[PDB]
Design a protein around this ligand. Structure first.
Ligand SMILES: NC(=O)c1ccc[n+]([C@@H]2O[C@H](COP(=O)([O-])OP(=O)(O)OC[C@H]3O[C@H](n4cnc5c(N)ncnc54)[C@H](OP(=O)(O)O)[C@@H]3O)[C@@H](O)[C@H]2O)c1
Ligand SMILES: NC(=O)c1ccc[n+]([C@@H]2O[C@H](COP(=O)([O-])OP(=O)(O)OC[C@H]3O[C@H](n4cnc5c(N)ncnc54)[C@H](OP(=O)(O)O)[C@H]3O)[C@@H](O)[C@H]2O)c1
Lengths: 348, 348
């Protein structure tokens, strides 16, 4: 048997990655696909303008899309709902599903910074899922909202976590070169990135500078106490389909050599024995001079591994390096799926 | 004015920009075009695989390419010779031209860090041209080798200069997103940047971390005393034809607000009213949220203006901002042409 699952915003960029991950899954059975009123009524293949380089999973093609309605009869037997909704629709619909007793695993920014909402990467702050007990008391529902972080934030935080545990953190500079896929099919126009780039992604730097502090914070007396290190981000959009690349410069508390930083990242593997279907080694170290590269490395761990290269001495801080993340798997859909897999094993 | 000039490596990427700049110049007349023996004897149009979005200037098309030989008949009345040679060929040919009493204005990295060789941006360190007198003593030739810096270095240094004069410099972080045209026509393969990027450009970070200190250093007792601020670069190659974009994070000595940084950059204009043909305002400030963009802004000042946008507070240092440079004009050919214009108008 399997836990029956649904997807909100199933036809969009993240939704399609949810669909790929859940079509054939050992724990979860995809039984419900939700989108807007326009898509509701049609087969998934017709409602969705599919833009993945692998075809729609065969068992999902003819699955009829339903409206985003928690009390719809197709949602009655589903226990876990994955959300790929835009933020404003997430504020409306996600509490509705939680009131119906359903577990919401959301990529939307809406509830990320709420004090009773877990903002989780399972390798980093799994214990923050304890906030659901608190959430249920204060909100009065028996469901739950669990959020995964912003894609750029996940990439940085995974690499920073083992460093912080061993050497502490003082200050982090990050410059990103971000793919277009997360903005949706009609998100980034061709002329924004054709022989061009954009040195701006609305709210991206703010998200990186704030979400990171909660993720690397400490749960204490029913609240997450934000981390105290300093963080400055500069975000950019480039002509890449999938894969966010980050130039990261790190100042530790204790001081650290590049070889020591490499070691803690390589040994970082807190989820190895948990038998999670979407598991991958958190950080894969490249020794090549010109790696990671989005096209060559984004499929690492089926899109779930962060790939790090060029770990070297920084003239100013301690260490600088390049990190790559599949922005749409580890950065979103995979982040929530891993969250859900971990949640049913360890929580309730 | 019709001062006769030559171009070394005239057929390559920087060579073509030299040709564009010098074909119809109010001071210089292009009379000699030098390249390899493969190209020698051919009309420029046949020898050069021209890849600029504007056609070869009509007067240069039928001009016969000559060998790279300072003794050549076409170099007799030519005192000013521009060099777009690769470094290893520059080490061979540039001293040969200096020995023939010619002034080499070079984009090659070969002689940049020689202590008797000027490494000059006229807006920044025009006084470093005095090094040619020390150079003539040491080397025993009556010509000179005068270099412009690395394209990435120029962009950063131009922005840092007015900041250093007013507020001083402690530390600078730079992350670059670099166009492909600098590597030459056969430099960056399509599959390096098609739905991809390379987080590495050989020796680029080293150049930025070393050349900057000479450019911003103080000439004293016939030597440049290197600047003492800390600098760390991360360089990347992206799918852009022309235009290098840099994310810069600056820590000043005295402390500064974004508006103060904006003001000193906007007022930075030491070369105005000299009637230099290749003059442009050094730094153009964009107020838009998503500017500068390579395709929109690289033509600013005909490729000679550095374009800066998104000047804002840094959570760690004082200020962060985005800088853009046309990498082949201001970054290379225009850099040396401006050097030579300043040379006749100010140095002789
Ligand atoms: N584009 C930019 O913005 C930029 C900026 C900074 C630096 N650069 C420099 O430009 C280089 C790459 O571009 P590119 O396409 O110009 O390289 P390239 O194709 O090697 O062209 C440079 C010159 O060297 C070549 N050459 C080979 N053997 C020669 C010889 N015996 N004598 C004279 N020239 C010889 C070419 O001559 P033939 O064509 O006749 O073979 C050409 O004229 C890099 O090394 C870099 O340092 C470019
Ligand atoms: N993919 C990633 O890796 C990733 C990472 C981070 C963030 N994101 C997020 O994903 C978003 C952009 O991607 P996208 O193209 O998926 O956007 P989107 O298509 O607008 O959002 C997903 C869903 O919203 C749409 N929608 C419009 N009106 C609706 C309604 N009344 N009820 C339910 N859905 C409605 C789509 O339905 P129809 O198709 O039926 O119109 C459906 O695909 C951003 O807002 C961003 O926050 C994605």
């Amino acid at each position: 048997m399997k836990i029956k699952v649904g997807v909100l915003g199933a036809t969009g960029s993240v939704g399609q990655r949810f669909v790929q991950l859940l079509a054939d899954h050992p724990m979860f059975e995809l039984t419900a696909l939700a989108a807007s009123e326009r898509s509701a009524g049609k087969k998934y293949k017709d409602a969705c303008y599919w833009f993945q380089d692998r075809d729609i999973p065969e068992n999902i093609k003819d699955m009829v899309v339903i409206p985003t309605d928690p009390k719809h009869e197709e949602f009655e037997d589903v226990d876990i709902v994955f959300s790929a909704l835009p933020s404003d629709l997430a504020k409306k619909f996600e509490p509705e599903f939680a009131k119906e007793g359903k577990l919401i695993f959301s990529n939307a920014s809406a509830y990320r910074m709420e004090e009773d909402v877990p903002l989780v990467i399972p390798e980093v702050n799994a214990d923050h899922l304890e906030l659901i007990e608190i959430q249920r008391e204060k909100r009065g529902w028996d469901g739950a909202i669990i959020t995964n972080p912003n894609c750029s934030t996940i990439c940085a935080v995974i690499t920073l976590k083992p460093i912080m545990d061993k050497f502490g953190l003082e200050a982090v500079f990050i410059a990103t070169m971000q793919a277009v896929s997360g903005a949706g099919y009609n998100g980034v126009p061709s002329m924004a990135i054709l022989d061009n780039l954009i040195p701006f992604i609305k709210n991206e730097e703010e998200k990186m500078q704030t979400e990171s502090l909660k993720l690397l914070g400490t749960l204490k007396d029913g609240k997450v106490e934000l981390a105290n290190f300093k963080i400055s981000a500069s975000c950019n959009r480039v002509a890449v389909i999938d894969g966010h690349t980050e130039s990261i410069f790190v100042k530790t508390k204790e001081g650290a050599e590049p070889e020591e930083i490499k070691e803690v990242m390589d040994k970082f593997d807190p989820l190895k024995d948990l038998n999670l279907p979407t598991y991958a080694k958190p950080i894969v170290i490249r020794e090549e001079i010109d790696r990671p590269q989005p096209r060559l490395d984004r499929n690492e761990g089926n899109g779930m591994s962060i790939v790090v290269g060029r770990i070297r001495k920084d003239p100013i801080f301690d260490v600088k390096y390049t990190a790559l993340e599949h922005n749409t798997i580890r950065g979103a859909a995979g982040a929530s799926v891993l969250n859900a897999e971990y949640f049913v094993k360890k929580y309730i």
